[PDB]
Design a protein around this ligand. Structure first.
Ligand code: NA
Lengths: 66, 66
C-alpha cells in the first residue's frame, strides 16, 4: 500500500483528500473506505491505501484507517 | 457507472469477475463491495459498478448489489 494522512474529509458530502509526503493530494470517496465503522474519515487520520485511475484521474482505493 | 452480473466469485479467496453484456469481464475484489454485511457475491448476482485502473490492470470499484 501507500501511507498518508487525511488532509480533510467532509462527512456530509462523503469525500475529501489524503495528503502524501512528496506527492499530490489524492481524492478519497467514502465508497473506498474499509471496515465496519462509519465510512468517514477525519483530518489528520492516518490511512493506508492504493492509488487507482478513475475517469477523473487518481483516486484512493482500499482505504484502511490506522 | 454501469451494470453487469457476477460471472463467478471464489468466496474463500474473496475475488471473482463481473460479466458485461457486449464487453469484457471485469475483475472484482471483495474490498470493492458496498453495503453492510459479509463481503461476498454469488454467481448471477446483478451489480452496478465503476471501472478503475490499478497497477494490475482494470478492476471494479463501488460494487453495489442490484
Ligand atoms: Na461479455
Amino acid at each position: 500500500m501507500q501511507e498518508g494522512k487525511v488532509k480533510w474529509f467532509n462527512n456530509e458530502k462523503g469525500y475529501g483528500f489524503i495528503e502524501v509526503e512528496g506527492g499530490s493530494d489524492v481524492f478519497v470517496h467514502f465508497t473506498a473506505i474499509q471496515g465496519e465503522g462509519f465510512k468517514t474519515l477525519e483530518e489528520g487520520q492516518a490511512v493506508s491505501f492504493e492509488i487507482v485511475q478513475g475517469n477523473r484521474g487518481p483516486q484512493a482505493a482500499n482505504v484502511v484507517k490506522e
